[PDB]
Design a protein around this ligand. Sequence first.
Ligand SMILES: *[C@@H]1O[C@@H](C)[C@@H](O)[C@@H](O)[C@@H]1O
Length: 130
Amino acid sequence: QVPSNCDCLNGGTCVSNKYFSNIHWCNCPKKFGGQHCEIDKSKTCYEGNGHFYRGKASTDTMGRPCLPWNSATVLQQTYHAHRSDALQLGLGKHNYCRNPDNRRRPWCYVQVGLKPLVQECMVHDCADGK
Ligand SMILES: *[C@@H]1O[C@@H](C)[C@@H](O)[C@@H](O)[C@@H]1O
């Protein structure tokens, strides 16, 4: 143990609070990591929660390409390319995943056997799949 009101690496930043007796925290870049932030990683596949998102992730949390919002199936669902608020998320002619409702990760109407179920399009990891 090394009570130093902080502990990072790779030249991290040793910070410490004083308005609560002791509320410090390793001050390392968000792209850092490694126990005490000893690596220059770069985790950030969605600065938001999935509201807009502008990457390439088009599959769901399984791998399927998910159904586009123009697939009559999703048209039968709710948030597709023919509801009334799809113009706010631009769902028509496109796929990826949208989260205009109440959810943390971006989901997409992906066919789940016989009913396009919204699945938080797994958007984790983003480095050549490795
Ligand atoms: C910790 O403090 C911050 C403000 C930056 O100077 C970092 O480079 C440093 O490690």
